[PDB]
Amino acid sequence: LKTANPFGLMVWCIILGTPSKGFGLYPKNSSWAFGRLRQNFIYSGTQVPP
């Protein structure tokens, strides 16, 4: 009822047998191309207003 850990959710999935890669897991930094600033290499208004 309060599980927030994606690891616990994946363990639950293994318990129940459902496939897991059909679900978005986490918004954390572990996702590709994330950072505290992350303002570089992106269209930061000098190129394109996003």
């Binding site: 047998g17 459902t18 496939p19 897991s20 890669k21 059909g22």
Partner: peptide
């Protein structure tokens, strides 16, 4: 083939 548990 995926089977019954998808893998990235």
């Amino acid at each position: 083939q995926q089977g019954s548990s998808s893998v990235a």
